Design a protein around this nucleic acid. Structure first.
Ligand SMILES: [Mg+2]
Ligand SMILES: [Mg+2]
Ligand SMILES: [Mg+2]
Ligand SMILES: [Mg+2]
Ligand SMILES: [Mg+2]
Ligand SMILES: [Mg+2]
Ligand SMILES: [Mg+2]
Ligand SMILES: [Mg+2]
Ligand SMILES: [Mg+2]
Ligand SMILES: [Mg+2]
Ligand SMILES: [Zn+2]
Lengths: 94, 176, 135, 136, 38, 134
RNA sequence: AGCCAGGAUGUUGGCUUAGAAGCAGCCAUCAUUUAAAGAAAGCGUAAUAGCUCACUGGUCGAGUCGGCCUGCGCGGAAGAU
RNA sequence: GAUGUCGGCUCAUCACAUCCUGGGGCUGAAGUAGGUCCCAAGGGUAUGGCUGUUCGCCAUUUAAAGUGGUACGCGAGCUGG
């Protein structure tokens, strides 16, 4: 069971997203259902080592946003053009 | 590090004198002295010698490893002693000792007379053998190299001054 | 490379043969060619003896389950085991002739009755004849 | 040697080679040779690299060339002054932005594909990286 | 001695050594494998 | 000390055994007749291997070994020469009864404990020469 | 990592060749005794021998191996008063 | 409102990417002689036949007959092919 820790984004946009990546973190989104989409930030190293396993893209993952637990499935991934890094992840509510 | 952490056991009859960084090791075979690198902290105590780094020195452990190794072969030196054996290969190549001078006939116009330094002694059991004996591992090693230098083993017949434990690889001449 | 699964399997195979056999012979075999060994393996299978070279750490594990728990101090240096499953004896005599004829090794210690046999007193299991001798 | 079979026009403006690549994923094979640099690959460089990797895999497996040299490059000869019309077309290049997957391979073990790509990379004017196929 | 920008281990007996800030390839088996970076 | 393979009733010609064993220090007329006197029981047209043990006094003692595995598979299948490209080109066929016949003869030199162990050791010699088990 | 010991049998695998016996090439690459030993990674022989490795048992006694993201350096670096 | 052009003569000066001599590694280096490369700029480094030639070809030397920069060095120094 993959458990991802996340914080809610206090900011949005180009400026703010680039600042996260410089801080070894990356933006991501949680959408789907009647619920409003949740803009979140993830630790780069942690999620990077997780996504290395094929099960990440198939299995239901749990995202821990300020105590609360959210069952999701990896919908889409924006990868760095040439480096082994992640730019953004789309998470769909399962 | 794995070397520095391993203690040197000073046997009975061996006197160790430490004056800061200067170490004098006196035994039955002789007396050797060495100045250790400032990064080394040498401790005596019991029938052993222990080495370690000194605070503020970057390469401390590497230095302490060398310091150990040298002091271990200093102890071996003043007790057991060291022996290097050389053997002359080739027609007319001969050697003889006359006190502290090794007379070498090695295919040159003039015979070679090599003066031995303080502490190294030599004897010729054969006309084609040199046996060096001393307490300083570096100096015996140096003299053995200098004697070898007059005629280094050639690769077509193995001719020349070679160490006893030396593997002299030979080859065939260009075909046609 | 030996995995723990492989190590547990080797402890199992030598633990099973430990119970069943009657007389076990522990000896050195360093500095002996495969030609003389394949010759003691043919002379072993014939006499109903099980021949093996096992890691001394792996031996102190298969032997902990009784009765050879006195062969511990013999698991220092190269160790070769001779488990006689068919008729007690066989190996303790087969090894004594192989030791004298080849001059290499010394033969560590023997075991029978769940009791320790020293390197000097191996003449006890060497003079014992057949089963098959009482008639 | 790759080249367009026909073109709407003979010659083309120099232009620029700004931006990041399109086609940054192994989409046909199991392994790829991704560009980390920015530059032009000539039809001769592309062929040189293709030959190297083909010889390497002993003509086993399958190779894909994700780049096409569709850009005509003109050149003025020696002893020719400036002006008097645009030069003549001499060779064809493919503009390369960081991220472009240049070559793809499958039907060979990873170790071999890695070596074949090491050999081809030496024939190229731009820095490359080895890439593996991914699940999304 | 082979002086070149790219110095590499050519066999198992090759060894990479740094002597007075110069990368060298010293080889115990083949004298032809002796290299200096320059 | 040298290893050779000489015929059942033939030992004397210069190209196969002549200066091969004679260069060490072995009597060319003493061994040639002592070998054929002991291999007289061995069938005609079967190469028999022999190992020579020589000492410092030019003296010699030999122990005769059973015919080779690649040798017995040729007479059992009915072939003079093997396949140039084994497992790519089939040159003959040998039954399971013929495999145990070669193994029972080779038992004196084989390392195997059981009949099935010696039979599989002949199965490997057949595959590596183009002969298929049928 | 170092050091001790082994690195066997069928078998000189088959074809080819004056010879090819792990070691010119070509094709196959199993099976046995096994602690482990490729029908053989290199040197050597006219072909053998002989030397060593892959692999494994012993000794030793606590760390060791090399990929990833990165900061700062090193080589690559020859010119004319 | 002028910075005389090629070649020669005379006189040079620097670079080193070294032709010779010196040191050294590899060699498919037995020796003699070579090949290749590294260090080295201290000194040294032909005369002639043909052509305005520089060059080049040729003859005969020599340890060698280096490659370049200096307004393709040098006409308030000479020559004028
Ligand atoms: Mg902006
Ligand atoms: Mg130096
Ligand atoms: Mg004026
Ligand atoms: Mg220079
Ligand atoms: Mg060159
Ligand atoms: Mg000069
Ligand atoms: Mg005239
Ligand atoms: Mg000349
Ligand atoms: Mg001028
Ligand atoms: Mg004038
Ligand atoms: Zn090497």
């Amino acid at each position: 069971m993959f458990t991802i820790n996340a914080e809610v984004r206090k900011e949005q946009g180009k400026g703010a997203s680039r600042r996260l990546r410089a801080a070894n973190k990356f933006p991501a989104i949680i959408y789907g259902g009647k619920e409003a989409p949740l803009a979140i930030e993830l630790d780069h190293d942690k999620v990077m080592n997780m996504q290395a396993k094929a099960e990440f893209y198939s299995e239901v993952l749990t995202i821990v946003v300020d105590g609360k637990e959210i069952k999701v499935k990896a919908q889409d991934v924006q990868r760095h053009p040439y480096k082994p890094k992640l730019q953004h992840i789309d998470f769909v509510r399962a | 590090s794995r070397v520095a952490k391993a203690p040197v056991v000073v046997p009975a009859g061996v006197d160790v004198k430490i004056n800061g960084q200067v170490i004098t090791i006196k035994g039955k075979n002789g007396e050797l002295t060495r100045t250790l690198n400032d990064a080394v902290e040498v401790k005596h105590a019991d029938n052993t010698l222990t080495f370690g780094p000194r605070d503020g020195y970057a390469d401390g452990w590497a230095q302490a490893g060398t310091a150990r190794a040298l002091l271990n072969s200093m102890v071996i030196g003043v007790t057991e002693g060291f022996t290097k054996k050389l053997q002359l290969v080739g027609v007319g190549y001969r050697a003889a000792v006359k006190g502290n001078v090794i007379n070498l006939s090695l295919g040159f116009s003039h015979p070679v007379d090599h003066q031995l330094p303080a502490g190294i002694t030599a004897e010729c059991p054969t006309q084609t053998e040199i046996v060096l004996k001393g307490a300083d591992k570096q100096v015996i090693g140096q003299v053995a190299a200098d004697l070898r230098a007059y005629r280094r083993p050639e690769p077509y017949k193995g001719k020349g001054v070679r160490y006893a434990d030396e593997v002299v690889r030979t080859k065939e001449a260009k075909k046609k | 490379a030996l995995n723990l699964q492989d190590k547990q399997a080797i402890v199992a195979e030598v633990s099973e043969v430990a119970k069943g056999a009657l007389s076990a012979v522990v000896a050195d075999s360093r500095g002996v060619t495969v030609d003389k060994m394949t010759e003691l393996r043919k002379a072993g299978r014939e006499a109903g003896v099980y021949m093996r070279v096992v890691r001394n750490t792996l031996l102190r594990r298969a032997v902990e389950g009784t009765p050879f728990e006195c062969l511990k101090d013999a698991f220092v240096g190269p160790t070769l085991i001779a488990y006689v499953t068919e008729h007690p004896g066989a190996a303790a005599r087969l090894f004594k002739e192989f030791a004298k004829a080849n001059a290499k090794f010394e033969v560590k210690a023997a075991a029978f009755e769940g009791e320790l046999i020293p390197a000097s007193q191996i003449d006890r299991l060497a003079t014992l004849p057949t089963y098959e001798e009482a008639i | 040697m790759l080249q367009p079979k026909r073109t709407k026009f003979r010659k083309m403006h120099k232009g620029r080679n700004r931006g990041l690549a399109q086609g940054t994923d192994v989409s046909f094979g199991s392994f790829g040779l991704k560009a980390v640099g920015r530059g032009r690959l000539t039809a001769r460089q592309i062929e040189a690299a293709r030959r190297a990797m083909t010889r390497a895999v002993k003509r086993q497996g399958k190779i894909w060339i994700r780049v096409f040299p569709d850009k005509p490059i003109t050149e003025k000869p020696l002893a020719v002054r400036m002006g008097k019309g645009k030069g003549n077309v001499e060779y064809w290049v493919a503009l390369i932005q960081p991220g472009k997957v240049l070559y793809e391979m499958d039907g060979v073990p990873e170790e071999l594909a890695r070596e074949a790509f090491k050999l081809a990379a030496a024939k190229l004017p731009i820095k490359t990286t080895f890439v593996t196929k991914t699940v999304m | 001695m082979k002086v070149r920008a790219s110095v590499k281990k050519l066999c198992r007996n090759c060894k990479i050594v740094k002597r007075d800030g110069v990368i060298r390839v010293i080889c115990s088996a083949e004298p032809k494998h002796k290299q200096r970076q320059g | 000390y040298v290893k050779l393979q000489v015929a059942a009733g033939m030992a004397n010609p210069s190209p196969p055994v002549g200066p091969a064993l004679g260069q060490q220090g072995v009597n060319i007329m003493e061994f040639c007749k002592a070998f054929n006197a002991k291999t007289d029981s061995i069938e005609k047209g079967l190469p028999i291997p022999v190992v020579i043990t020589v000492y410092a006094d030019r003296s010699f003692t030999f122990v005769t070994k059973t015919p080779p595995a690649a040798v017995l598979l040729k007479k059992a299948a009915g072939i003079k020469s093997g396949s140039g490209k084994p497992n790519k080109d089939k040159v003959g066929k040998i039954s399971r009864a013929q495999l145990q016949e070669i193994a029972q003869t080779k038992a004196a030199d084989m390392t195997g404990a059981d009949i099935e162990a010696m039979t599989r050791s002949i199965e490997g010699t057949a595959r590596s020469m183009g002969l298929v088990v049928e």
